[PDB]
Design a protein around this ligand. Structure first.
Ligand SMILES: Cc1nc2c(c(-c3ccc(Cl)cc3Cl)c1CN)C(=O)N(CC(=O)N(C)C)C2
Ligand SMILES: Cc1nc2c(c(-c3ccc(Cl)cc3Cl)c1CN)C(=O)N(CC(=O)N(C)C)C2
Lengths: 728, 728
């Protein structure tokens, strides 16, 4: 083939994967944009028609960033002037556009600088957030109603998350939840008043004479947390003369006695809300079931029917308490629980009764509950073949739990072993999405007979190109250690000779519930390293990794920077055993948590590694945020777990670094893992007399993802790996 | 065999230059600290007596940072708890010890956290500064009088300088001048009210969870400067029950029409102060003569006695208008001035007369006036043998100016060509200190017939130790560009062989009025590079360099980053035509201004340099401070010099760096050249895909001089230079 997958190919996207992103607009149609025209498709028969023509906005004036369409298709939301803040948050300008007419709404427009916007679940109501305040417009051309007046920048958040919550709790900027009706609007309020600030320089354009200091409320492990309230407003009864009345649903009392989080919000029915709360020590959580009393207007949450969750071995849930999927009638739900043997399975709860019933079981885990109908529940799991890094779609029959059919396993077993799914409203149809090991494959299906209806995107175009190129293969297998199977992967150079010896790169994340050994097809830096530079690129899922049961996942509880670290080192040793690695040229690298584990590995004097790269690492767990850190570490107090906070820093290993080449890299505007963390790493290395290489990226945040920086760091890191391995 | 001068010998200071540091107490005695015993020496005959036993204060229980014995030595100040701020400023605790007894004073102590203290010129009054307010103690055990009440952290400075005055103007934290009596306290007051603050993180020990943000009033080029007022208080008439009355001296109308600085304060007599001011456009300075009115109680300056300095070619003075040296009666004074030929010489002014009269002339320069009697004026200049890089002490008979005789020229013409001096009161004796080209040599002399009295320090210890090492040698010499001489120096490896080609490191500074080609003996990094690594380290004084007259110094006027940059390049080209340099291995590097030039050079595309190092560079002149920048560049406005402010940035030249290996280094706590300057360079290089190398130093400032940082940067730069030269 002559040609390899080059650094420039990765950097420049020479070889692109086609996807198939559709948005279901009912039980049987969906939107999909062809070129830049928006099509609507009939699912059963496959015929499509143009829904919105690209030309419709050539005269709009602004470049449009995204669009959202109302449940009843009368209107369409156009998002422009998009300015990204954190990992999910951003502000933007908005226009709505009437579709029955071909006219753009000019009266009572949504404000510039809006922080969040969302239609009601049905109809064409709008709720948005602006200046930390919540507004509702019944009609798109009608004046809005102000629902809160408390909003204050960096202090009072109504209907949106502060930093920790967006990042660690809801994975979203949003904190609004319409009732299925579109009648109630629930929302959360966060109070950050006494939360300390992280302050760093942002240097901006050369033209800026003095650097700006950014100040964000950010609780580090042990520090004062934001506080939260929850409210529900009756949308229907919005007066033009009266301020609007928000009803408060206070947390359980088992929560109110100390710090706690609102971690899940789920409308069960028109008049039933489920709220899940989490104590600040995250081994204990409470689910409340709240019903609207039409007479009193209140929302009552009978103590009797709270559902309680505890862990003896760790925290609750994989990253947080699992979500409840309610049956249509609202009198019961399913939800992923860790069972008697510490494997996560689907439990079935009935609203006013004790315990729950496990409908699945086995030495493997359900990954997520995906859909629910009267006959069937649909979930993704890693049952098939006992590969914890595989995913398939299953359904179990509700009237007889022993009838579990697999919907995706045998579809095309050499190519697809990792699916996700998207169900149309009411689950009449699903799109399967296979991610590997072969090229991505998007197909439709109908629920009745689970017939495959058609192929949506088979990525044929990509395939014909890579036939020309010299691509690495991927080995998924496992080693045994004490008596546990531990899964790894190698990305192997083209024309692999196990009689030859290759430099190896241990690519680590290895953070809690991580999994770096899977069946996913990727085109990335590693592909480059293997194809062009003939470097093997390994990942190993050691203790602390996920999707294999609490025994392994919890092995690291309160004890970060130990077994997950030890195990990476041990894997490198197994990898040397296998006689196709150059035991002399082993390297290691990670981003984020991977940077922390990498640094610790390099500071353990193991002797196994020659050099490694750490990007935006944690260095000391008191520096990272409360919600994430305390989950595994508890509090940094003498009475809790300060001893291991102090004892699990990178800085304290600095002396050992003189036995390796180390490259340390961090963005200065990193709002997540603060430049501070590496600012301390280098000082400790300096103070002890160890030479090391370094690179800062000015104004880049945690993702060091701007196009120029992203090309620059992988170019810089590629040089560092080449030199280490003596590669031409 | 012999051994070599290693990286470690430098870092660990294996070979030490001894000094003889004394301070003159009278016309005939001096104080000298020896083995922590404080001794009094009689100059004439050499006999000494122990003034204070090194054993005293073994009972103190603090480390004692420094001492200060009152003029009339009844008391001694003990400085402890010293904590450094900027280059001069700091805070400390004090105690007074009564020598005329045996006890420390217990009551009315000087406060902790005091910012400045000083005795009066005679006796033992005390002036000090605490929380930005001035206090005076007539007697050490008595309570202080409060002089000002306006002091406010970061905003009003009474009796002390802000950041720019400390750094760029007075080269001192002090803004107190006692009159000769001890009768008057004169002081300045500064107002940084509207001055902008540079902000940066300080990370501190590992134990600090949240990084600190430091904030310094600091005017960048073009921005709002502090304003200043000057006051004189009478120490004698301090009423214990009435707020002391301060007399303000106003700046001349020709300064009050705009932004100006107070740039020099000198007491002429008991009743006459000289004040020099300088317009913010440093073209124009005015010396005011102020007499104390005995009846008015006030101070008057007759516009008639004003003396005005204008430079049309550049700025006034080498860095500022020169210091006036008054005759005993205060009716006349002497001053260094650039003459018509642009060379700096001694001028003679009489108070109530218009111009002045030059005491010296010729194509060399006077560096400084050192002592004045009725018979002679003593000065250092670089006349001898016409070497600008040399320094010698001269005395000029004041009754006949043709009668200039040189005092240190022929003492040891081989060993000593660079002298500095220190006279006793009334100049009966003087200590000479030569610093090169041989080991430093400290000598004492009587002035009646310029007889040498004795050797104080000959550095025989160092001499003995160096016999065992292959020291490099130092060529000093000049080349001709466009029909003018320009000097350079070359540190040459031991056993230099003009037949071989050596790699060449160019060591640069090149700031206005700088000088890197001189006759002084240094033990530093270059010395290591030449002795062990056999590298030539050369330095060159091109245009803009000082001590050679205004044609050369002022060439750079308003065009920083041009002629001094072209010229460092042309010198390197000339250095290849010398047949002992490898023109395939030529490096360049510099700190501070040296960093800016090294960067401008590596970015010029000359192709002359293989690689360079820049340490704490300026990148854009709008980033540096007003007083220094606008001195050479004017204001950054479209009416003045905006265009060349922007034509002179490093960032503009980013592209050309792909042709070179570039290492960029900077401390994150640089209060002086802010880390911003370097963060903008790296962002420039990143936006255009130039790979390069970086290193920041956590919490280090412009000096990067903490012991561990110091060692790490030079170890790091040494690797870079070595690998770049492919040295074994
Ligand atoms: C919401 C979240 N998402 C991600 C990470 C982390 C995270 C975990 C630990 C640390 Cl120390 C820092 C972060 Cl940002 C967090 C939670 N804060 C992370 O690292 N990512 C990369 C990843 O998960 N990959 C590359 C597999 C994505
Ligand atoms: C008061 C002062 N003292 C020094 C320097 C500068 C200076 C000049 C230009 C720039 Cl951009 C920055 C500084 Cl800090 C200044 C005035 N700011 C400097 O650099 N030094 C090095 C030196 O004496 N050498 C290397 C010979 C010592």
């Amino acid at each position: 083939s002559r040609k390899t997958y080059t650094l420039t190919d990765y950097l420049k996207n020479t070889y692109r994967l086609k996807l198939y992103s559709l948005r279901w607009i009912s039980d049987h149609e969906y939107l999909y944009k062809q070129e830049n025209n928006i099509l609507v498709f009939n699912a059963e028969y496959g015929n499509s028609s143009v829904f919105l023509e690209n030309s419709t906005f050539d005269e709009f004036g602004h470049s449009i960033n995204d669009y959202s369409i109302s449940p009843d298709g009368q209107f369409i939301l156009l998002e422009y002037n998009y300015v990204k803040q954190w990992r999910h948050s951003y502000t933007a300008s908005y226009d709505i556009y009437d579709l029955n007419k071909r006219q753009l709404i000019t009266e009572e427009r949504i404000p510039n600088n809006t922080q969040w916007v969302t239609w009601s679940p049905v109809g064409h109501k709008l709720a948005y957030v602006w200046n930390n305040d919540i507004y509702v417009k019944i009609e798109p051309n009608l004046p809005s109603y102000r629902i809160t007046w408390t909003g204050k920048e960096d202090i009072i958040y109504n209907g949106i998350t502060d930093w920790v919550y967006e990042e660690e709790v809801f994975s979203a900027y949003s904190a609004l939840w319409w009732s299925p009706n579109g009648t109630f609007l629930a929302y959360a309020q966060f109070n950050d008043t006494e939360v300390p600030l992280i302050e760093y320089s942002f240097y901006s354009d050369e033209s800026l004479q003095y650097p700006k200091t950014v100040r964000v409320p950010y609780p580090k492990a042990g520090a004062v947390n934001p506080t939260v309230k929850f409210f529900v407003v009756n949308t229907d009864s919005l007066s033009s003369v009266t301020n609007a009345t928000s009803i408060q649903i206070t947390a359980p009392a088992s929560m109110l006695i100390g710090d706690h989080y609102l971690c899940d919000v789920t409308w069960a029915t028109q008049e039933r809300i489920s709220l899940q709360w989490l104590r600040r020590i995250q081994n204990y959580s409470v689910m409340d079931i709240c019903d609207y009393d039409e007479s009193s207007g209140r929302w009552n949450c009978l103590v009797a029917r709270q559902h309680i969750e505890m862990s003896t071995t760790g925290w609750v849930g994989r990253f947080r308490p699992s979500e409840p999927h309610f049956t249509l009638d609202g009198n019961s739900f399913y939800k992923i629980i860790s069972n008697e043997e510490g494997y996560r399975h689907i439990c079935y709860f009935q609203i006013d009764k004790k315990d729950c019933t496990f409908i699945t079981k086995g030495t493997w885990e359900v990954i997520g509950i995906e859909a629910l109908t009267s006959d069937y529940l649909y979930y993704i799991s890693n049952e098939y073949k006992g590969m914890p890094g595989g995913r398939n779609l299953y359904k179990i029959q509700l009237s007889d739990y022993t009838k579990v059919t697999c919907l995706s396993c045998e579809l095309n077993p050499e190519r697809c072993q990792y699916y996700s799914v998207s169900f149309s409203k009411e689950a009449k149809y699903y799109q399967l999405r296979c991610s590997g090991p072969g090229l991505p494959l998007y197909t439709l299906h109908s629920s009745v007979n689970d017939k495959g209806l058609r192929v949506l995107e088979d990525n044929s175009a990509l395939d014909k190109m890579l036939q020309n190129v010299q691509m690495p293969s991927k080995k998924l297998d496992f080693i045994i250690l004490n008596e546990t199977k531990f899964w790894y992967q190698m990305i192997l150079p083209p024309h692999f000779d196990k009689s030859k010896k290759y430099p190896l790169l241990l690519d680590v994340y290895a953070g809690p519930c991580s999994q770096k050994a899977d069946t996913v097809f990727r085109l990335n830096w590693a592909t480059y390293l293997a194809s062009t530079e003939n470097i093997i690129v390994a990942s190993f899922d050691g203790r602390g990794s996920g999707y294999q049961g609490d025994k392994i996942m919890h092995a690291i509880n309160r004890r970060l920077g130990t077994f997950e670290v030890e195990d990476q080192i041990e894997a490198a040793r197994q990898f040397s055993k296998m006689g196709f690695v150059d035991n002399k040229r082993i390297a290691i690298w990670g981003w984020s948590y991977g940077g922390y584990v990498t640094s610790m590995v390099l500071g353990s004097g193991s002797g196994v590694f020659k050099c490694g790269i750490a990007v935006a690492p944690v260095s000391r767990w008191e520096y990272y945020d409360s919600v994430y850190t305390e989950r595994y570490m508890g509090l940094p107090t003498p009475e809790d777990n300060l001893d291991h906070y102090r004892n699990s820093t990178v800085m304290s290993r600095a002396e050992n670094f003189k036995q390796v080449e180390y490259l340390l890299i961090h963005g200065t505007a990193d709002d997540n893992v603060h430049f501070q963390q590496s600012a301390q790493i280098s000082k400790a290395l300096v103070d002890v007399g160890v030479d090391f290489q370094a690179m800062w990226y000015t104004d880049e945040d945690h993702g060091i993802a701007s196009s120029t920086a992203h090309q620059h760091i992988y170019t810089h890191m590629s040089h560092f790996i080449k030199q280490c391995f003596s590669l031409p």
